[PDB]
mmCIF file of N, CA, C and O and ligand atoms in Angstrom:
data_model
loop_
_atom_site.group_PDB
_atom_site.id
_atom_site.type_symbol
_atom_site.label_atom_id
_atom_site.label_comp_id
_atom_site.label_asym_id
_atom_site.label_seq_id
_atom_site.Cartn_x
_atom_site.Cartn_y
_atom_site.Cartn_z
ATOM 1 N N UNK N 1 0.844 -1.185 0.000
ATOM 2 C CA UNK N 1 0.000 0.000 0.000
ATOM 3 C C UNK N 1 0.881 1.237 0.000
ATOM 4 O O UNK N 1 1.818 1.500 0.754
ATOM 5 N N UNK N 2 0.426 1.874 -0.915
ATOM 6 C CA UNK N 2 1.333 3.337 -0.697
ATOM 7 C C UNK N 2 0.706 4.442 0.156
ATOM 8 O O UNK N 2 -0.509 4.586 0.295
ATOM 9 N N UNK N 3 1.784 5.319 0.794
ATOM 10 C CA UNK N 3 1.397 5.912 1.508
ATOM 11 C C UNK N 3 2.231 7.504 1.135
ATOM 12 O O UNK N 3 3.438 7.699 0.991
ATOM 13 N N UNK N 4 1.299 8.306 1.066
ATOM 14 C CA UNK N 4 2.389 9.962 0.787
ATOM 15 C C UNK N 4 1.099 11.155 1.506
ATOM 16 O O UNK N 4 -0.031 11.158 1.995
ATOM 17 N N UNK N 5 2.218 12.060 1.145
ATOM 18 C CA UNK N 5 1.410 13.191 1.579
ATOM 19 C C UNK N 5 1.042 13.467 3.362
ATOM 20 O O UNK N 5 -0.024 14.072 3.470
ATOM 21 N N UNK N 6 1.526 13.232 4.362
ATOM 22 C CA UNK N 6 1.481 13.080 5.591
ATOM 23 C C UNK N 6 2.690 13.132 6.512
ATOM 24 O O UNK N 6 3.842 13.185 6.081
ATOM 25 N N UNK N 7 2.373 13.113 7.783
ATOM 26 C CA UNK N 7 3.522 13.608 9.074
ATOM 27 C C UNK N 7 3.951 11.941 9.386
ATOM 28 O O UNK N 7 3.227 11.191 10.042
ATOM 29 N N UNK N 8 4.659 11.723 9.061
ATOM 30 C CA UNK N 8 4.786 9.931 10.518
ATOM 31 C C UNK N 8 5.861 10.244 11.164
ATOM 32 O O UNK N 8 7.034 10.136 10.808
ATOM 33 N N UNK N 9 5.157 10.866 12.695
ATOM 34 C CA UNK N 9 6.142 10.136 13.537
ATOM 35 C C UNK N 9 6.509 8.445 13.946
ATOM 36 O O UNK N 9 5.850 7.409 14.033
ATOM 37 N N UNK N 10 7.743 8.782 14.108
ATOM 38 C CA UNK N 10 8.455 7.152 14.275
ATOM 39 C C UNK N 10 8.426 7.145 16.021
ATOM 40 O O UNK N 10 8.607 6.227 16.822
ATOM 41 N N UNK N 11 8.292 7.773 16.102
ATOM 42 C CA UNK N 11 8.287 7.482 17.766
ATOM 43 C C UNK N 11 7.314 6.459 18.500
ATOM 44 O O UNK N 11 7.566 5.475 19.195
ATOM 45 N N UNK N 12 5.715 7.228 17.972
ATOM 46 C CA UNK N 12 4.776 6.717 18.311
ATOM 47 C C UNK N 12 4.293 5.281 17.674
ATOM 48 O O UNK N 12 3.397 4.623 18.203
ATOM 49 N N UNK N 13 5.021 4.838 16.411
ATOM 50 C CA UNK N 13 5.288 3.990 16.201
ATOM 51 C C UNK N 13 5.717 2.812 16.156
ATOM 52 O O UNK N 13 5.165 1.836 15.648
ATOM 53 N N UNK N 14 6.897 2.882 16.784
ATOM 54 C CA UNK N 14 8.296 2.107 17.616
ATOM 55 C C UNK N 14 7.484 2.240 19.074
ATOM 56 O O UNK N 14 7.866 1.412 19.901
ATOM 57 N N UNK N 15 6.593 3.003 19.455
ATOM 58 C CA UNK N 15 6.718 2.499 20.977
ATOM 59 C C UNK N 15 4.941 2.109 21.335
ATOM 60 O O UNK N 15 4.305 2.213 22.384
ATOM 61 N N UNK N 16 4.541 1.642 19.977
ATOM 62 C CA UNK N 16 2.765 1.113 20.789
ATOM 63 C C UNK N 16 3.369 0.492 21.404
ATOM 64 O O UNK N 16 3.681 0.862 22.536
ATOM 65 N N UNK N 17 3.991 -1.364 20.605
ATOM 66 C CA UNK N 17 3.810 -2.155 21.452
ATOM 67 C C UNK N 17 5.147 -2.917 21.660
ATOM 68 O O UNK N 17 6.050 -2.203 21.222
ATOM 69 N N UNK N 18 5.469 -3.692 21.988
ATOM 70 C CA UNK N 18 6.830 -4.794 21.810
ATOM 71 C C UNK N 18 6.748 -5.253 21.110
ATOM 72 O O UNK N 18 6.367 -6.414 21.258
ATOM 73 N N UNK N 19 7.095 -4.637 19.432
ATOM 74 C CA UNK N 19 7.167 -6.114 17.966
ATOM 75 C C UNK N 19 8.215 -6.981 18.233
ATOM 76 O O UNK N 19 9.423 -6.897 18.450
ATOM 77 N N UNK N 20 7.040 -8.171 18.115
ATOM 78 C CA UNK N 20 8.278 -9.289 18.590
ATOM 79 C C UNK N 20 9.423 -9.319 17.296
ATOM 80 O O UNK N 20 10.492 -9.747 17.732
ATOM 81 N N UNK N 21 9.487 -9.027 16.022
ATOM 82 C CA UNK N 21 10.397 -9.223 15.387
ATOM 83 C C UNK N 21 10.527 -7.695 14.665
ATOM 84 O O UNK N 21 10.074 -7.694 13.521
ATOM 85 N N UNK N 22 11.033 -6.471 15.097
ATOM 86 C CA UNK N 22 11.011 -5.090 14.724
ATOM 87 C C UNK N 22 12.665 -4.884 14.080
ATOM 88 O O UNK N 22 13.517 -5.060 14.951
ATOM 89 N N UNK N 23 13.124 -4.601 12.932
ATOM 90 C CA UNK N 23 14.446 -4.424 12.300
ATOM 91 C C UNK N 23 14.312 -3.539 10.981
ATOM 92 O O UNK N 23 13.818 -3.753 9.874
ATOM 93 N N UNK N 24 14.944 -2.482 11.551
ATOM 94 C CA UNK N 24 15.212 -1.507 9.932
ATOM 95 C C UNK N 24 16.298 -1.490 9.167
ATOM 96 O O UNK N 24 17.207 -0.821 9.659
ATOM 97 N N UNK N 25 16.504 -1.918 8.276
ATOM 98 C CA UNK N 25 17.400 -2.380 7.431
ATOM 99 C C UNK N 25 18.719 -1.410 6.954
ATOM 100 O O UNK N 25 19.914 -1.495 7.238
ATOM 101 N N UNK N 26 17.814 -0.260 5.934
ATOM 102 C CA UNK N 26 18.493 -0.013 5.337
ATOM 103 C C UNK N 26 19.136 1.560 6.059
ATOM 104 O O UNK N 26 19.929 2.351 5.548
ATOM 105 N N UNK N 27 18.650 1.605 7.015
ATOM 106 C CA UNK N 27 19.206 3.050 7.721
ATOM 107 C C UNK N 27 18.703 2.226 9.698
ATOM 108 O O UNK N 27 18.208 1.212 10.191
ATOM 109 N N UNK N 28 19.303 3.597 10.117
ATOM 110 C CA UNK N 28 19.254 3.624 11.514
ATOM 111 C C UNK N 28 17.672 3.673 11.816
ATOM 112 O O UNK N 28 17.013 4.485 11.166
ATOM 113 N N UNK N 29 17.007 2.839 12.780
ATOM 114 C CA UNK N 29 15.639 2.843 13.069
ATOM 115 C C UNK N 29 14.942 4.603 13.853
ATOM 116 O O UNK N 29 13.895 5.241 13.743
ATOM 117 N N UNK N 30 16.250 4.774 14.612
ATOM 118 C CA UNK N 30 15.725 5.899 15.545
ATOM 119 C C UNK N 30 15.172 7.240 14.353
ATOM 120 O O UNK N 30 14.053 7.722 14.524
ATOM 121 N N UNK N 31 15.983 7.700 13.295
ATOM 122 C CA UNK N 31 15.818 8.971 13.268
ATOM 123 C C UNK N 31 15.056 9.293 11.876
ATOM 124 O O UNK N 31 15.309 10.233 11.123
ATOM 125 N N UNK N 32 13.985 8.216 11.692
ATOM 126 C CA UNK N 32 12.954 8.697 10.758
ATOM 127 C C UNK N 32 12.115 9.638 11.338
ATOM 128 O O UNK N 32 11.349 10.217 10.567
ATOM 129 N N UNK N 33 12.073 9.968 12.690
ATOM 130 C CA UNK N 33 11.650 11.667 12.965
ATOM 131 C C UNK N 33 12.385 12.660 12.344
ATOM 132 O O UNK N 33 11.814 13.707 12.040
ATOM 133 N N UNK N 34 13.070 12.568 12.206
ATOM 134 C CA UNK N 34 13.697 13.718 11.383
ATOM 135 C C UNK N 34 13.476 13.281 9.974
ATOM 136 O O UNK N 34 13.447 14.333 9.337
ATOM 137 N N UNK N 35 13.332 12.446 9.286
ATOM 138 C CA UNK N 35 13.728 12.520 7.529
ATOM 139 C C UNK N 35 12.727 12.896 7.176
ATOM 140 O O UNK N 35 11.731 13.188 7.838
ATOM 141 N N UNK N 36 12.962 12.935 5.698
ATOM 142 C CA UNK N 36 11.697 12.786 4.651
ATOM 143 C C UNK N 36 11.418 11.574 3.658
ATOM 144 O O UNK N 36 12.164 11.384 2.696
ATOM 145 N N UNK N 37 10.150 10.631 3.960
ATOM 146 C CA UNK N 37 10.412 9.616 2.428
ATOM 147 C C UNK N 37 9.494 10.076 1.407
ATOM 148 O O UNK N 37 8.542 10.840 1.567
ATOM 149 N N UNK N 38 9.896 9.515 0.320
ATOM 150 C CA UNK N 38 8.311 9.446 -0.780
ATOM 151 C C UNK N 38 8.656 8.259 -1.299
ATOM 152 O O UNK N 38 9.617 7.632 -1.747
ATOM 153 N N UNK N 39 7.086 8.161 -0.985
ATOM 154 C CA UNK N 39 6.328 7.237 -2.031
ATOM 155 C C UNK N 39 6.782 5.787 -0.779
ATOM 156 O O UNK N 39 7.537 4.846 -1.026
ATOM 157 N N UNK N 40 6.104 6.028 0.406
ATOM 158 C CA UNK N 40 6.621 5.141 1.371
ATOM 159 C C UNK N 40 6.116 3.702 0.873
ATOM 160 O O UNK N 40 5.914 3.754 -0.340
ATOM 161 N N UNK N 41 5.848 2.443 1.405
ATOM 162 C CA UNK N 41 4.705 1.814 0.768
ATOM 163 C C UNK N 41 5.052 0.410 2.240
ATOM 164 O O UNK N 41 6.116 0.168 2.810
ATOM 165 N N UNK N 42 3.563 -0.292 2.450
ATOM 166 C CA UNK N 42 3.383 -0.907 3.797
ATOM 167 C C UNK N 42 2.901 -2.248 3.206
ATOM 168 O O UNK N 42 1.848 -2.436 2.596
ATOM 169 N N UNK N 43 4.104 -3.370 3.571
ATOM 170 C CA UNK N 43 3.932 -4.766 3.040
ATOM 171 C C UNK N 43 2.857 -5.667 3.813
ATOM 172 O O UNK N 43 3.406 -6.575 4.437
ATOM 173 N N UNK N 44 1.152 -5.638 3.953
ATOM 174 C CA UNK N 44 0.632 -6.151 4.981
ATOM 175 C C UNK N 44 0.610 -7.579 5.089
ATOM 176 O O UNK N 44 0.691 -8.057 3.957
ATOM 177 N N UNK N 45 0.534 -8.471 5.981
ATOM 178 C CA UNK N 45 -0.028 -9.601 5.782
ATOM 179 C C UNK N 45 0.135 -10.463 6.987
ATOM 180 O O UNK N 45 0.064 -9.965 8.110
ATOM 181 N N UNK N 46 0.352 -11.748 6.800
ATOM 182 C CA UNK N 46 0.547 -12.713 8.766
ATOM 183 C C UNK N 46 1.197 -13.761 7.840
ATOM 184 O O UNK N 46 0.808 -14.275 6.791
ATOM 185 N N UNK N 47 2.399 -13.915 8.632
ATOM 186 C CA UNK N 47 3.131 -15.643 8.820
ATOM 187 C C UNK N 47 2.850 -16.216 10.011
ATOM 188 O O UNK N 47 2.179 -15.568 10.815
ATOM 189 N N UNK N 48 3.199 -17.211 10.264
ATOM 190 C CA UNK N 48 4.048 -18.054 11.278
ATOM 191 C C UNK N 48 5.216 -17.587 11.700
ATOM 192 O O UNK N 48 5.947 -17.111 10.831
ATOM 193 N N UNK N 49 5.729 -17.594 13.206
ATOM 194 C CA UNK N 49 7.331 -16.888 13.590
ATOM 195 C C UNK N 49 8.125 -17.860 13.228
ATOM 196 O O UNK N 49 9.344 -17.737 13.347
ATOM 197 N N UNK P 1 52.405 22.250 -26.711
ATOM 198 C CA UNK P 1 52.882 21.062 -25.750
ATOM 199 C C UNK P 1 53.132 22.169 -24.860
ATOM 200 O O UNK P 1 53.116 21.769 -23.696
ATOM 201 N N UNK P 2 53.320 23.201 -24.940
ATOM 202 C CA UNK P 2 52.870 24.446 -23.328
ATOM 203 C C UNK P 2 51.426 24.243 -23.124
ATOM 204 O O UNK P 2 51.201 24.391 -21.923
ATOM 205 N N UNK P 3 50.270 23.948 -23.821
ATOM 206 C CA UNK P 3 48.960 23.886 -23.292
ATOM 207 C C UNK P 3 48.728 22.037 -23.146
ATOM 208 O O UNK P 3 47.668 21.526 -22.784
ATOM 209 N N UNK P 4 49.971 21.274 -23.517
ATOM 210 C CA UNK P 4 49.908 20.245 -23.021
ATOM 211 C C UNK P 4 50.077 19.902 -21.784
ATOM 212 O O UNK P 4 49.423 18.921 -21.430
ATOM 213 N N UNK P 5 50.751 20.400 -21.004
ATOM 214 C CA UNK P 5 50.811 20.274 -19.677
ATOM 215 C C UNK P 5 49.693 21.075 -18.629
ATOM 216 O O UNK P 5 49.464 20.794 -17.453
ATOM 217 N N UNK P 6 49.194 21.962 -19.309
ATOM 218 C CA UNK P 6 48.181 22.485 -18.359
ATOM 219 C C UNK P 6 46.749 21.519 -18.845
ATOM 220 O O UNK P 6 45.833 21.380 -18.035
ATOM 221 N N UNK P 7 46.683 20.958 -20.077
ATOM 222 C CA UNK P 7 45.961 20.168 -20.319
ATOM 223 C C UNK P 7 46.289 18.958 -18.900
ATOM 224 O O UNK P 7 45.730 18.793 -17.816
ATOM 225 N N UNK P 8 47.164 18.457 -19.404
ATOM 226 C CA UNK P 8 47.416 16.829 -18.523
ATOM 227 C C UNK P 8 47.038 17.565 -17.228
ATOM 228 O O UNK P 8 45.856 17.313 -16.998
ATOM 229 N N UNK P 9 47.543 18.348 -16.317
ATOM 230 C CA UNK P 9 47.130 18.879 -15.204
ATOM 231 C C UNK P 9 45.191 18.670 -14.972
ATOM 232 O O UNK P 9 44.551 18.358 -13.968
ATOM 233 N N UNK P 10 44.800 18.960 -16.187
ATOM 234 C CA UNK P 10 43.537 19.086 -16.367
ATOM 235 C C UNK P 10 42.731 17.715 -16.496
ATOM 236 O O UNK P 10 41.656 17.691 -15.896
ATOM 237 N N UNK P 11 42.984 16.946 -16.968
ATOM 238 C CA UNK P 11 42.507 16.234 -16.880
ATOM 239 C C UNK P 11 42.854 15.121 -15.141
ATOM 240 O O UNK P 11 42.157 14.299 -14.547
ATOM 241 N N UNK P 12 43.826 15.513 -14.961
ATOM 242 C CA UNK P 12 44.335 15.194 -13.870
ATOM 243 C C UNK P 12 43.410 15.711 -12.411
ATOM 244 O O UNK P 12 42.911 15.015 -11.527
ATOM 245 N N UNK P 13 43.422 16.797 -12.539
ATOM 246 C CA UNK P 13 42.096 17.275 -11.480
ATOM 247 C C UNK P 13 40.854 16.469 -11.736
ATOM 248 O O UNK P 13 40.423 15.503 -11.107
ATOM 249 N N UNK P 14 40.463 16.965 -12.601
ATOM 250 C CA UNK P 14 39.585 16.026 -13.349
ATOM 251 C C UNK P 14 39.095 15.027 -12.661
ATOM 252 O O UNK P 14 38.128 15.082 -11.902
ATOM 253 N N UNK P 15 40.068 13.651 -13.034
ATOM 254 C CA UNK P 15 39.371 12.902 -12.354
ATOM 255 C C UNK P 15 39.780 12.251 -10.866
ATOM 256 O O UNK P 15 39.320 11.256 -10.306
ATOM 257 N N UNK P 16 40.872 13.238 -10.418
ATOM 258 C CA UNK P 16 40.729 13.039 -8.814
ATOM 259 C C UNK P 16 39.129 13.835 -8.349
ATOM 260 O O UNK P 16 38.491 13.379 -7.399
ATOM 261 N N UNK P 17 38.786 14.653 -8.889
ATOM 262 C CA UNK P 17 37.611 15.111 -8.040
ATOM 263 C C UNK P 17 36.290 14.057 -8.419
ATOM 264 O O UNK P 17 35.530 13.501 -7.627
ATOM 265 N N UNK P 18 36.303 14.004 -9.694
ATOM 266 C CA UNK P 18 35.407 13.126 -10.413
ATOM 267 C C UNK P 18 35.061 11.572 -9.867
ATOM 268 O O UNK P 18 33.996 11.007 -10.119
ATOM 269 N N UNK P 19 36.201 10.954 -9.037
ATOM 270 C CA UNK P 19 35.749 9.516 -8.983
ATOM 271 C C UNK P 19 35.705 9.426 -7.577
ATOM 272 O O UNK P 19 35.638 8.311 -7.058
ATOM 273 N N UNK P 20 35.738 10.627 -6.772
ATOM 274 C CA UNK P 20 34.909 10.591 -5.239
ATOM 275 C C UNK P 20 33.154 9.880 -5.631
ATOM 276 O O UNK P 20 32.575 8.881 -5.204
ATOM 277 N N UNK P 21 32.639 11.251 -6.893
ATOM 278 C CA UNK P 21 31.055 10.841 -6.992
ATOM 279 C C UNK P 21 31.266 9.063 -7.476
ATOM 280 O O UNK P 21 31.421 8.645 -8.624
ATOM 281 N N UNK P 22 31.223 8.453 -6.512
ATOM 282 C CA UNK P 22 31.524 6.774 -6.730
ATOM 283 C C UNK P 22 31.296 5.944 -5.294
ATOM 284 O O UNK P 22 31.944 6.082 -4.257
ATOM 285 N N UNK P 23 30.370 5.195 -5.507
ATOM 286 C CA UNK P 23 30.568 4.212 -4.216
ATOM 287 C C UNK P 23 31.671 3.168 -4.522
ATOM 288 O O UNK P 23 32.479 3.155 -5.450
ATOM 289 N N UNK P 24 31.497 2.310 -3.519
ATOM 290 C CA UNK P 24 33.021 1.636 -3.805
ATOM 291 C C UNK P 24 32.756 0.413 -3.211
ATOM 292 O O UNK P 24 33.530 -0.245 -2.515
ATOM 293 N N UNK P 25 31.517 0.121 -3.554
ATOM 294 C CA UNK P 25 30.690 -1.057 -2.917
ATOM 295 C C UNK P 25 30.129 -0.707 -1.464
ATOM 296 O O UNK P 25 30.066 -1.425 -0.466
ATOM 297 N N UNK P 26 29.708 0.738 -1.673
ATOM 298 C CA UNK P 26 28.930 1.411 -0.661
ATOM 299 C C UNK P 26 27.963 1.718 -1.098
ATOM 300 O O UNK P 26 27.936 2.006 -2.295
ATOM 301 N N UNK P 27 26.459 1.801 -0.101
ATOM 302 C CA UNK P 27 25.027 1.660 -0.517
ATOM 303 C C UNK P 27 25.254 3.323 -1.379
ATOM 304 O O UNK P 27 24.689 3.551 -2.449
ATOM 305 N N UNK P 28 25.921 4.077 -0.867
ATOM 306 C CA UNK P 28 25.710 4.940 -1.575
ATOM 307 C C UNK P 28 27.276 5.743 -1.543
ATOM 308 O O UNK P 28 28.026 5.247 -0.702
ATOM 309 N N UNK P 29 27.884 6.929 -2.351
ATOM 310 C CA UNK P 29 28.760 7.421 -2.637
ATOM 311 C C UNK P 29 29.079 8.669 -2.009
ATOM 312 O O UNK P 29 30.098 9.243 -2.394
ATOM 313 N N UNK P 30 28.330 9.224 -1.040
ATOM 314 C CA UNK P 30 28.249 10.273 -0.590
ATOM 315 C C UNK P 30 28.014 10.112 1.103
ATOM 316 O O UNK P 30 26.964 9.691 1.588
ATOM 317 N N UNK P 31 29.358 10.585 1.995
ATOM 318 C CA UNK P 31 29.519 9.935 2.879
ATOM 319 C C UNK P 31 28.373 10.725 4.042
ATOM 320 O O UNK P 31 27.829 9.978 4.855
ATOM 321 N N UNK P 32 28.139 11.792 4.069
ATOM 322 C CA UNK P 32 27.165 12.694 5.085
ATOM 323 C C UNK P 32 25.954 11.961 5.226
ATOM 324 O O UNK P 32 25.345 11.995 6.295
ATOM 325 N N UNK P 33 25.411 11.084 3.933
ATOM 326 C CA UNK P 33 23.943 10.443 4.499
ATOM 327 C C UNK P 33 24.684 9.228 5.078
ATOM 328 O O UNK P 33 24.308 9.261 6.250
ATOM 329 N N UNK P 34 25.435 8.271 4.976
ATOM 330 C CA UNK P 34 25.552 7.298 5.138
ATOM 331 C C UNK P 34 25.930 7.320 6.591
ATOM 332 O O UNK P 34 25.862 6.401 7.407
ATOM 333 N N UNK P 35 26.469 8.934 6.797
ATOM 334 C CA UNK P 35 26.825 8.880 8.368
ATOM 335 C C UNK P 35 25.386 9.022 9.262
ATOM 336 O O UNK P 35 24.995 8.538 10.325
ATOM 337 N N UNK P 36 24.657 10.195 7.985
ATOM 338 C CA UNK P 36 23.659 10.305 8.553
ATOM 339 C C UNK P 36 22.205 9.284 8.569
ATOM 340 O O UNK P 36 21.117 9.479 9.109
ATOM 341 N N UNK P 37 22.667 8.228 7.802
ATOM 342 C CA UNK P 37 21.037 7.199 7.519
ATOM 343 C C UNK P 37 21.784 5.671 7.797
ATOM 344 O O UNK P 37 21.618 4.633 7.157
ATOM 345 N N UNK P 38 22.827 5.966 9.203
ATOM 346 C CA UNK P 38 22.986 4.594 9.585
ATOM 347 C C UNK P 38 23.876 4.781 11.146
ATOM 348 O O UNK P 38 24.115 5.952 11.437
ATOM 349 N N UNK P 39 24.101 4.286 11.605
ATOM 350 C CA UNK P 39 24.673 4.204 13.002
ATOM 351 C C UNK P 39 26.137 3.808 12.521
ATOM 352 O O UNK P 39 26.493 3.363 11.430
ATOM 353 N N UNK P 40 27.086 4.187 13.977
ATOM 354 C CA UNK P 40 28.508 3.914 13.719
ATOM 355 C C UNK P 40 28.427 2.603 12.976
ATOM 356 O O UNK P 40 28.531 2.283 11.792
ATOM 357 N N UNK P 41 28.182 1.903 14.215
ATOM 358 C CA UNK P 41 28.706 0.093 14.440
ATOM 359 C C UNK P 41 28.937 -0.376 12.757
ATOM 360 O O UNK P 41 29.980 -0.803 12.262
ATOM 361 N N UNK P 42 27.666 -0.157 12.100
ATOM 362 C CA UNK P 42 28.070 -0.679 10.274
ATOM 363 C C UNK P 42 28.554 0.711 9.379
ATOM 364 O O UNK P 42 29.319 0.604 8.420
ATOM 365 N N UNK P 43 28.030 1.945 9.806
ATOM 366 C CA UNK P 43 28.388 2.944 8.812
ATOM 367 C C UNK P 43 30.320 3.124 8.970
ATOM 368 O O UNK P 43 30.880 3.885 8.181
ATOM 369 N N UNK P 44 31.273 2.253 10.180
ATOM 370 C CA UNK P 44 32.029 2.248 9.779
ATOM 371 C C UNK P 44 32.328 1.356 8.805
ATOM 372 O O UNK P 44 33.197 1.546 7.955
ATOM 373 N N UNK P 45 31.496 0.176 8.910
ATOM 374 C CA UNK P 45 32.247 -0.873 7.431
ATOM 375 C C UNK P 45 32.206 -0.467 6.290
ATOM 376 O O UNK P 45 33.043 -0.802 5.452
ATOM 377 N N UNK P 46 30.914 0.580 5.973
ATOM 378 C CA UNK P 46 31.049 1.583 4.613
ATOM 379 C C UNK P 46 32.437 2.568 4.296
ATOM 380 O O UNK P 46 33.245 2.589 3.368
ATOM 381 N N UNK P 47 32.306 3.227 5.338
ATOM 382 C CA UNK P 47 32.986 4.406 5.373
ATOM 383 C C UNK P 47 34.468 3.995 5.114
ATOM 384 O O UNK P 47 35.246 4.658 4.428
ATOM 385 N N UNK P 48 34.755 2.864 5.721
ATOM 386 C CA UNK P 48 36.098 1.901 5.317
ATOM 387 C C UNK P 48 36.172 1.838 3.864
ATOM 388 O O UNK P 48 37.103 2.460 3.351
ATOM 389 N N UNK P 49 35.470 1.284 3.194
ATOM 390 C CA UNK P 49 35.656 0.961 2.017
ATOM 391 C C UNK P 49 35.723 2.006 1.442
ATOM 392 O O UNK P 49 35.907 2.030 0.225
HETATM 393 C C1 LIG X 101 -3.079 0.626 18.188
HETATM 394 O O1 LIG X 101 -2.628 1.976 18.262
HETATM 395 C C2 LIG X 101 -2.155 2.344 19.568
HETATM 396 C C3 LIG X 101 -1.769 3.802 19.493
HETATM 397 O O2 LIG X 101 -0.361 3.962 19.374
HETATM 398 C C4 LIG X 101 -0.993 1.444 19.989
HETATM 399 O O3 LIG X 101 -0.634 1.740 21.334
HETATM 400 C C5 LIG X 101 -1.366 -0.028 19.864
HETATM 401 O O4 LIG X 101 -0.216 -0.835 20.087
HETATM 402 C C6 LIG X 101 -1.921 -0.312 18.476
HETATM 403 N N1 LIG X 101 -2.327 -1.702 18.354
HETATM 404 C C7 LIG X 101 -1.727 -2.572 17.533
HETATM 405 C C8 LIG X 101 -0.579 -2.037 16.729
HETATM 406 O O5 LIG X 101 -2.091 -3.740 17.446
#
């Protein structure tokens, strides 16, 4: 799903809940409060752990 | 061959400045994001290379 045009804080994000498996890859997790993306896009779905 | 040597000079700047814009098997070639869109611990294994 794509997502643009909007504020995301990462804070409130990173801290609903305890993701049991939470890892950001391609940069540092903390300081997407500060950046800018476009053209973000959100892979949904459910496995097995 | 007097504008040969300010030539060779020239091309000589050239491409010392020219092959910085280059990763070097770094996500990217330009070291300020990489300091800035990753943490020490791996942005030194970039910054190495
Ligand atoms: C629903 O959103 C709230 C608000 O941040 C959060 O605390 C909670 O963990 C969310 N529930 C989920 C992600 O299942």
């Amino acid at each position: 799903k794509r997502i643009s045009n909007c504020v995301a804080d990462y804070s409130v994000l990173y801290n609903s809940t305890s993701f049991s498996t939470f890892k950001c890859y391609g940069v540092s997790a903390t300081k997407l409060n500060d950046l800018c993306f476009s053209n973000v896009y959100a892979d949904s779905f459910v496995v097995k752990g | 061959k007097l504008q040969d040597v300010v030539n060779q000079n020239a091309q000589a700047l050239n491409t010392l400045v020219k092959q910085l814009s280059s990763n070097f098997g770094a996500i990217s070639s330009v070291l300020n994001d990489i300091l800035s869109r990753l943490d020490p611990p791996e942005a030194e294994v970039q910054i190495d290379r």
